[PDB]
Amino acid sequence: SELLVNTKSGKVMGTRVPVLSSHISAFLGIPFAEPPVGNMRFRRPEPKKPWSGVWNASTYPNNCQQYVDEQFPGFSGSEMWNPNREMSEDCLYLNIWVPSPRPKSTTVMVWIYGGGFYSGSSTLDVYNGKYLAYTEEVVLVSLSYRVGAFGFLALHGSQEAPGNVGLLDQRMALQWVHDNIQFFGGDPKTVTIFGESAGGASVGMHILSPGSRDLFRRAILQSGSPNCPWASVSVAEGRRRAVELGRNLNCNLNSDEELIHCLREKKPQELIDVEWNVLPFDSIFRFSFVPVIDGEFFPTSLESMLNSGNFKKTQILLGVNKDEGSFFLLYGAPGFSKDSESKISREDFMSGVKLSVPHANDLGLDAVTLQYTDWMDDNNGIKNRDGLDDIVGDHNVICPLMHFVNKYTKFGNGTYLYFFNHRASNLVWPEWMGVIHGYEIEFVFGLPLVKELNYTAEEEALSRRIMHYWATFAKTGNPNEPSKWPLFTTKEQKFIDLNTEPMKVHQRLRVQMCVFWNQFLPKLLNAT
Amino acid sequence: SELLVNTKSGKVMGTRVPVLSSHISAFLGIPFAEPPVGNMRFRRPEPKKPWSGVWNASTYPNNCQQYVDEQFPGFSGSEMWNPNREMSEDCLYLNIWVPSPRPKSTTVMVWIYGGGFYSGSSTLDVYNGKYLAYTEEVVLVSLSYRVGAFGFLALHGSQEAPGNVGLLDQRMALQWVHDNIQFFGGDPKTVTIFGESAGGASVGMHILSPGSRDLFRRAILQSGSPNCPWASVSVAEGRRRAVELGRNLNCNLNSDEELIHCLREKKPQELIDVEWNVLPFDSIFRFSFVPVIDGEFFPTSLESMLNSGNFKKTQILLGVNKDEGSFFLLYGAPGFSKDSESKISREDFMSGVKLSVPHANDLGLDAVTLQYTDWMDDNNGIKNRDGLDDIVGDHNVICPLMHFVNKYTKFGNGTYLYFFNHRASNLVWPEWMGVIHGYEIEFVFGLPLVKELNYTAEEEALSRRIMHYWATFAKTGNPNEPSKWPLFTTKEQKFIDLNTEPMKVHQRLRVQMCVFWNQFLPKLLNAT
Numbered sequence A, B: 001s002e003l004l005v006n007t008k009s010g011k012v013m014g015t016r017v018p019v020l021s022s023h024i025s026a027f028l029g030i031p032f033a034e035p036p037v038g039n040m041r042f043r044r045p046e047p048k049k050p051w052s053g054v055w056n057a058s059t060y061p062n063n064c065q066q067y068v069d070e071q072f073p074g075f076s077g078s079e080m081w082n083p084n085r086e087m088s089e090d091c092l093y094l095n096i097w098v099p100s101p102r103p104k105s106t107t108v109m110v111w112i113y114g115g116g117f118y119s120g121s122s123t124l125d126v127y128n129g130k131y132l133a134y135t136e137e138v139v140l141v142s143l144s145y146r147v148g149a150f151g152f153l154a155l156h157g158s159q160e161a162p163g164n165v166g167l168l169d170q171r172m173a174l175q176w177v178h179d180n181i182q183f184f185g186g187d188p189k190t191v192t193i194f195g196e197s198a199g200g201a202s203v204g205m206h207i208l209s210p211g212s213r214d215l216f217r218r219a220i221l222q223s224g225s226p227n228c229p230w231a232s233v234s235v236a237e238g239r240r241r242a243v244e245l246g247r248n249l250n251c252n253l254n255s256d257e258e259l260i261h262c263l264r265e266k267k268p269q270e271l272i273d274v275e276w277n278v279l280p281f282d283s284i285f286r287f288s289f290v291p292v293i294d295g296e297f298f299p300t301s302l303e304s305m306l307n308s309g310n311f312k313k314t315q316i317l318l319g320v321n322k323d324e325g326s327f328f329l330l331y332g333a334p335g336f337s338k339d340s341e342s343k344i345s346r347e348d349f350m351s352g353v354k355l356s357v358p359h360a361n362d363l364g365l366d367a368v369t370l371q372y373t374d375w376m377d378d379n380n381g382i383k384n385r386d387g388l389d390d391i392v393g394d395h396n397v398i399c400p401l402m403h404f405v406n407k408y409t410k411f412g413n414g415t416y417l418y419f420f421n422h423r424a425s426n427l428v429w430p431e432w433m434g435v436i437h438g439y440e441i442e443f444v445f446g447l448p449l450v451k452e453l454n455y456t457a458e459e460e461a462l463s464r465r466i467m468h469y470w471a472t473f474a475k476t477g478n479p480n481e482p483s484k485w486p487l488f489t490t491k492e493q494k495f496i497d498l499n500t501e502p503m504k505v506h507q508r509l510r511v512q513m514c515v516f517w518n519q520f521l522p523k524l525l526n527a528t
């Protein structure tokens, strides 16, 4: 039977799922690590012990313990990102969609979820991998990994909570795919890892980390890059945050051992309830527990690794959305609301820039404000709102990605860059938010091909084109089928817009603003 | 006889001069101070001793000792600014053009020349006051004053070379006009002082200086303002420069007395030959001997005087030209030449910004470069050349004038602002230089009304309109005859373009760039 597969960890039994009036096989909830519970909380993952008998992989697994968004109860725009299965620390599982009949050796794509390293589930309706696996005939895998304090609490020097264990969870899932996917019909020589936001940062992190490089072939980064300002902290900052988390739960703070033991006795929800209290600054687009530059998973600073070519050399496809910042301003800056056009006063603008660059002195805040203010019309609410939206997206997503892509391309074997700017016709979020962080995903997973979701015919066509670019790149290292998406080169820096109209090619994506964020501001903050 | 006038200093005999197929009276070379020669070099001027008999004022006086431009021998573009009479330290004279027949009490305009405080003559063909005096029926006066070391060498504390004596020369000429112009038919209650470049800065300086305020009624500033970065130095800098001038002429430097005595024994040309050697930095748009913030002519810093309203409250008319910087780049920055289009490499751009803001550290130079570079097309020679031209004009002329006009308007009694952007049809300078520093003067003096000069009919009409705006403002405090040039107000900040087409009104002249030069950069240079 097509639904029975034997792996090095044991036998697994999948389920047949309907898709676009056809069917494919799904193997849901396959364990790839021992449950990281009890004394294992905060520690590096352990490989799953093989089992005798048949593992029932007919149903989605639990989601890892995480913050649950309750801002708009019942609103699908926000709830579509919340765990849709029960939460449990026993959550290290992966899901596989396999074309029917079973391929012999086909392209594999592995999806890494990305809610700021503090949230995310492999089971969301928008991550249903059946449409992509079916339409492009690829073996689709979605993994999971611990988020928040459970995956990133870091007390460098301790082996009990060394940090980066969520990244090590991802790596273990990639090790399992490398070692077992051939049994499901996947080609272990041709695995593409892809992810959005923190998943896009994670993808870039495995490209950098020596210990992860050999587990995959190529990579896709969507609105996220390893060097993002919110994606990592120093070991000293990680340490202070863990100590502050301990302080919020009245823990003995005398030694690492005392702190960790205290933290291990708390119910999951007690850690999540105070997680946001440890940020060192009043801020937006900053998350408490994130990867640490530790000297092990990352041998040195991300910038010297990028500068010296210390990273996997292969092909990458990556890009950003037009309004990366809106989601974060809506949820965290004064003057923005879901049900209004959110025109911002000059005062809210200024308080928004302070929130957006928490690490800046007054001179730096003045430099951002001058850069994004139209002084001929400074009281324009729309320009203020939009300027703030660009500050957040440029600083947190676009310019760090552009810096990553120019550094990478100097040593890599092929780069394709995109700018996604299509506002979906059925978007439930307000107009002012534009092309939102995360909203290209539904096109990558082919949701527009399902009629009941109400997309237009041109949106279904856009989805088909993106899925085929992603799968063709995964299979060959080039999104084009031999209108051509041109290679991004050091010299010409070309990229394409991705939307419903004829493909346009442009050059130097947001160069003007990114010279400010990547070269001028850091110099300013460092000199002063 | 119309040509004989009796003054408090004695009788003066003028000459009849032809103008536009008519005639008017001219009283040229009337002395208003004792010659500042010998032991009087560097000292405050002394009032001219009255004379018995008749002063022959039929011919232009000598010009003060100054640097002579020899860059383009015989080229009229440059030579039109050079002294056209013999140079002499005996040069403190004024010229008067009087309508015929002699008015009883008409509006008076007094012109202050302005070659960077180191050059200028009241006798240039472009300053011939007969056209304006005749066409607008005003009594026109042009004064003179010592320039260079002779007028601005400053050794604060010494009474032998206290500094600002060139400004005191201007003041003495204004005192003489106040006391005697009624005899020539001028109204001492209605005197407008006007000047361009350093003359525009000087005008603003008499508006600020308590000791000059009561000598005139209203003021016109053309491409110059008192707070310009090149218009004044501290007493410590003035002192260092005088000491360095002494060092270049092998003077005993033991005391002020020794230095001054040494300097007084040098021929005029020996001082001028080394004048440029005392600048403290490699630079452009910086002059050696300029006014000093001394605690006397200027009671405190120009900025606190501007901020506190410590200045004459009256009406002012002022403005700038479109390409104020070109003259200075041509003469002093690498890559610019008179006979080529002067497209500038990225390298010459950068070396041009260093020259343009000599007082800036590397971070500030980076801030100017980022502000003026189109990073999508950074190797564009034309954009590089034009960006540099704007940096020079914005930093040296436009933004300081805008800062002056916003501070002044808060306390003044009426402000009219203009932007002159007409490229004359017969300009002999290259196209790349645009609307050059100083080239609105010929329109203010009505040169286009003389056919042999080859201007177009629309240029003659532009000239007539500017002369009538200037004279009507001088007479009433409003350029408009009761298409209206609107008042510049704190709130709306309106100004008009001055050129051959229908008047357009705009707001906030170069605000974007001036917030950078007036608010951000100074903060940056001060913090770091």
Ligand SMILES: O=c1ccc2c([nH]1)CCC[C@@H]2NCCCCCCCCCCN[C@H]1CCCc2[nH]c(=O)ccc21
Pocket (backbone or CB within 6 Å): A081, A113, A114, A115, A116, A119, A120, A121, A196, A197, A276, A283, A284, A285, A286, A327, A328, A331, A332, A437, A438, A439
């Ligand atoms: O797999 C996943 C899971 C979720 C998501 C994606 N992917 C991709 C698309 C985006 C989505 N998550 C977007 C989610 C939108 C981001 C903001 C959620 C934080 C709310 C709780 C904290 N509230 C405040 C106080 C703390 C600081 C702070 N900081 C802020 O930036 C905003 C609010 C606040």
Ligand SMILES: O=c1ccc2c([nH]1)CCC[C@@H]2NCCCCCCCCCCN[C@H]1CCCc2[nH]c(=O)ccc21
Pocket (backbone or CB within 6 Å): B081, B113, B114, B115, B116, B119, B120, B121, B196, B197, B276, B283, B284, B285, B286, B327, B328, B331, B332, B437, B438, B439
């Ligand atoms: O009454 C007057 C007299 C002259 C002028 C005007 N008005 C108004 C219109 C302009 C004209 N003067 C413009 C004149 C154009 C400005 C430059 C003349 C300086 C040349 C000598 C010094 N050569 C170099 C070395 C020293 C530093 C340095 N710095 C520089 O900014 C340029 C060159 C150099």
Ligand SMILES: *[C@@H]1O[C@H](CO)[C@@H](O)[C@H](O)[C@H]1NC(C)=O
Pocket (backbone or CB within 6 Å): A056, A057, A058, A059
């Ligand atoms: C597989 O496990 C799920 C768990 O709820 C259950 O629905 C299904 O009956 C199981 N099938 C087998 C063969 O155990």
Ligand SMILES: *[C@@H]1O[C@H](CO)[C@@H](O)[C@H](O)[C@H]1NC(C)=O
Pocket (backbone or CB within 6 Å): A412, A413, A414, A415
């Ligand atoms: C990638 O590598 C191959 C072989 O190593 C080389 O021939 C090719 O030119 C490279 N492609 C790019 C875009 O660098």
Ligand SMILES: *[C@@H]1O[C@H](CO)[C@@H](O)[C@H](O)[C@H]1NC(C)=O
Pocket (backbone or CB within 6 Å): B056, B057, B058, B059
């Ligand atoms: C006036 O002085 C000038 C000086 O050159 C001379 O040309 C003219 O003859 C003089 N006239 C009288 C009346 O002295």
Ligand SMILES: *[C@@H]1O[C@H](CO)[C@@H](O)[C@H](O)[C@H]1NC(C)=O
Pocket (backbone or CB within 6 Å): B412, B413, B414, B415
């Ligand atoms: C100027 O002053 C007069 C009288 O002192 C006043 O009535 C008038 O409004 C003022 N004009 C401006 C533009 O301030």
